[PDB]
Design a protein around this ligand. Sequence first.
Ligand SMILES: O=C(NCCCNc1nc(Nc2cccc(NC(=O)N3CCCC3)c2)ncc1I)c1cccs1
Ligand SMILES: O=C(NCCCNc1nc(Nc2cccc(NC(=O)N3CCCC3)c2)ncc1I)c1cccs1
Lengths: 648, 648
Amino acid sequence: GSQSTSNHLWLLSDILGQGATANVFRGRHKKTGDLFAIKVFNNISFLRPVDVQMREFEVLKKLNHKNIVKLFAIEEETTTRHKVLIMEFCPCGSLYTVLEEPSNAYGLPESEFLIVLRDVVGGMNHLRENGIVHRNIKPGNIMRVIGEDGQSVYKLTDFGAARELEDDEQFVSLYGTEEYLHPDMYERAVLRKDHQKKYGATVDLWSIGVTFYHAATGSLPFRPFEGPRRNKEVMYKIITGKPSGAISGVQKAENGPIDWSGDMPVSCSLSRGLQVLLTPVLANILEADQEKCWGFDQFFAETSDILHRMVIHVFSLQQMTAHKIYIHSYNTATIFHELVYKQTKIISSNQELIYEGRRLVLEPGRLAQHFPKTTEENPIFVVSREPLNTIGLIYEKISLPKVHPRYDLDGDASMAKAITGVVCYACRIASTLLLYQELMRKGIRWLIELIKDDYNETVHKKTEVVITLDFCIRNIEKTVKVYEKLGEISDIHTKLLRLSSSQGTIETSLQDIDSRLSPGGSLADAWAHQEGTHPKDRNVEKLQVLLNCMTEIYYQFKKDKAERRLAYNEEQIHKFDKQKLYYHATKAMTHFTDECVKKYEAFLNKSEEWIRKMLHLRKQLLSLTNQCFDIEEEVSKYQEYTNELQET
Amino acid sequence: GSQSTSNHLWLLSDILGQGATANVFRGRHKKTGDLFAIKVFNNISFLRPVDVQMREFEVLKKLNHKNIVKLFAIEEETTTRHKVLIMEFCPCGSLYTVLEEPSNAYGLPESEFLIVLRDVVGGMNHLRENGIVHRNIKPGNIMRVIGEDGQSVYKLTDFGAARELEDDEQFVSLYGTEEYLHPDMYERAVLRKDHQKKYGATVDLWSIGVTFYHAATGSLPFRPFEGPRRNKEVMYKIITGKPSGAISGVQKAENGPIDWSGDMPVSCSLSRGLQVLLTPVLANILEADQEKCWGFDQFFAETSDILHRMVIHVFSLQQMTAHKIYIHSYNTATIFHELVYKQTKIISSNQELIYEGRRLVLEPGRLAQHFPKTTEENPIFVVSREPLNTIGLIYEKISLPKVHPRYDLDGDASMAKAITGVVCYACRIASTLLLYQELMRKGIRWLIELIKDDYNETVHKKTEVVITLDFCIRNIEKTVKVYEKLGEISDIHTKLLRLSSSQGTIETSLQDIDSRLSPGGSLADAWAHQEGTHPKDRNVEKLQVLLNCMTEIYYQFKKDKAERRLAYNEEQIHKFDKQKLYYHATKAMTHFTDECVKKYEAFLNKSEEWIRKMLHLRKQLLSLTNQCFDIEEEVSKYQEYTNELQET
Ligand SMILES: O=C(NCCCNc1nc(Nc2cccc(NC(=O)N3CCCC3)c2)ncc1I)c1cccs1
Ligand SMILES: O=C(NCCCNc1nc(Nc2cccc(NC(=O)N3CCCC3)c2)ncc1I)c1cccs1
């Protein structure tokens, strides 16, 4: 069976989505053969008043955006003469399709997540300008397309639950999915509890809030033990009893206590600087009370505050940590040091910056626009003088789910995704560990070369200091000899001889430091090229190979799950590949824990020692340099004492 | 239909390859279900003597290697009781399968090519140790597998043309493919011309030589106008009339002159340093005369000479060129400067090295093993003082093949590969251009910061010079005054006053240079962040997107070519996608020539100017620094003249 129109034709076999009122089919144009999404209304929809079915058509006419799926034309089917919608086709799937990829099981990358935020807001903002509410915002209703620049672009669709609504106009009707439903709408739609309430446009922001937490963590904010489906009552108690500010809540036992948390889970894949901005945003937009809830202006202000911010990559040698500093293009270096202090706890005055081999000096009022180009591979380093605990990288240690001998195809494919998702997360940490050690080797190399510059300039000063002093003591000796031929002077020589003797000891102790900076002087960076891992070890490429064999089985298990039943051939191979998948995953985790992690552990342990070796040396080099300056400001009073004896 | 054995079973539908004597089928083990390649001999093979069919089994028993497809067992078919071979399965295809990928149409990458060389030699070397000749070495007979580390691994197979042969033992029988055939064997196998000749083990090296040229360029060395198939006679005249040393020869007209070349084509994707080692190797192993031909020792010596070499990435700012220096781990920096001079034409003494923000100094005898880690993204820069022409990147400008309105499915899929291969090459150049400009910005930034160090130390010397001079002239004035109270000296003051006046002019002209190094002093690198392209332009990602749409159509055209005939649906869509493929390719080439290339052209033009601005300034800064040293060696004769007047 297949339907057709005047300018379009589609198969009933190609179904993009299946909704209540209508379905959406992958179809082609009759003349050009180009792909378009055809939405066909079923007869059930025609048993609604003439105003409801009118809006959805009058809505798409007024709406056209880059973050909204473009409606090209409205035509009639050849037989039923039903109104069909010619929508823009998005072959890349929906946001739901993306979140099914095992790599995103523990949250989207920091890059693809910001795109989602950028496009969703932009689509919702365009709905706000026209005054259209959606009331059904789910990852399934957010499509994804590949732009000309490769960057993903997200558009909103499925406006079957949409209608024209004024800025302050309320309603009583119900729309939306279960998990992404507002506490007040969940009260009537799921538990069905009428306390005589009305709903504004705040219900859109909740559906957005739940969706956003799902993209960054890989799971829903509020999770009962049985789940939102198996136990609907617990789901409602969490959202209506949630403390103001909390962004998540999960019970870990059947009919037990609920664990609320006002912070992102460690499993998240976002930077620390991004979570600082995100957490308060999710806190206020997620609450039952309309008073404490945010408005669109307060929503857009904070989101546009984040999207306008650029990113300056900063790596701290002292703590061995990587940071993404989210700063505005119009902020100064003063605000920059504040933002770095908030994460790394380093005082603004102790922050010495290093970039591409050289130390970096910042003007107190230079804008962030003119800051040097930074990447994770080549960021700006921050080494402190004040001692700090080397924390390193923090990640949630996650193991493989237990495998049942059960044959359940739905369970195997679901186990396949989960277990492929754990290896994807393990591979993500391994590649991060490799970056930390490599930036460490580059940072330490740059640091020891920088200290040599301090040593060299100090010596140049010491040579400049010793010349003035040796001439001064030589010039007075001639003066006191012509006196004997024909109090102060005696008191001057005492200090001068003591200075020359102390200057001599400095000269010797500086050679000791030079012996420390010398190759193999305990401060050498030769240890770093042994202890930890190297890019030449190709540990990540190894993990990726096993992961390639795992993702091959997983996508095959989906097609086996899609068949519902399998022939004898595909059945027994599925039983065989189930252990092969497990033997691949266990080999990876074994290789991950025994090779990648351990070599990084030993690198972190030997890093702390060298840091303490460095901090000690820079202190001694500091004092000796200051002693050269103390004499420098002392000879300024000396060079004008004896040399000014010849005024007239 | 399907055959089976005692421990194995395979379908006759799954065919890996089809040869003369036997075929190879993708099969599975009965118990484990693991994949193995089953080779089944046809009845035609049984009409050969008992010695010929014996060897191939006795050969695989004696041979087991990492670069040789492992034979696991020899079993008998259930019905025919024919001897079947259980071979190692290589799902990644053969070398022929790899060369069909459009990206490798103009030659393999420098990385995947060296792996081929490493594995082929290693496989051939293991054949040499056992004394087994192959006589059928083709890209189809070289399999590829993904190692545990992700690196490709190539193994030899199809030993149907193989037999035991001593180190000096010859033969008269014939084996091999047409294009990869030795001139003496081509003389009897294709043109069939018996001049009473015998063949040694040199015939293997020719089949290797032709294969290697096919992997680096993407085409065969000797190409007639019609081709090696449509015109067999011309093929023979090229290989038997080839000048000693030439590695290629192509006639560009029907029945016309042959164009010989002893150098790699510009379309090649190998570095300049790798072609220097490769060219002479291909020259001697490719010749009819056994006298001038190379032996395995002379073959292995040069190939192991290359494979033992490491790679030091070097970028020349002066010529705006990237270089791969192939050096041994036991070579010194003396040999290193020689290897750099051979490519960049820069004298060993004028070579000033820069790495990660700082200038690099090399010990005359330091081994290459301890050289700093280098990559293309972070290589060692070489800036000269002697002027050099800025060549930049050199590539062959290749356009799209003309598209016929003809419907020929074989022609369309072949046109699809070719036209997808041109966009792949265009995308390769674009990503290289992006790297050249980025390394240029980093190199120039590092350079101007380095010149500031030279300026600063010169000032420190000038301040050190001016102090001695000002004291010297002050010390003599007191001496000549006590003389008047109670020739040389007069001649000394003349030079001293002239030195102090010249020192004053230096002080002023140094401030001029400081005004040149100052932001916006015509030597600023602010121009580089405007003129050329940036990674933020995402030009490569754009080209990749169109290329993704093209590679989607190409693989679909292969399946359409495989069907031989198409249903009406797939037929007309093929006709529609043919222009869609062309509109994608033309949009890419248009975007490539008007955006990527042009912005790079303007960057190269503004680079030459700044280089001339830099070379001029460093000269003036040099002379002024030398004038400070000239006075320094002049005051050493002065400070011991007047200050030594007080000996007794
Ligand atoms: O409108 C709706 N709901 C929104 C959803 C349907 N709507 C559209 N869906 C696409 N495209 C699309 C979709 C889905 C999945 C995929 N891709 C995959 O799963 N793949 C393909 C590769 C392998 C796995 C591409 N375009 C346009 C539209 I409009 C409604 C559906 C039923 C009532 S309302
Ligand atoms: O031995 C022979 N000649 C060498 C060739 C055949 N021999 C083997 N071939 C594989 N594996 C294989 C092969 C080919 C193609 C591919 N892959 C593809 O084309 N694909 C798959 C993905 C889509 C495109 C994988 N293993 C083992 C062997 I042994 C002979 C063949 C007939 C007489 S002799």
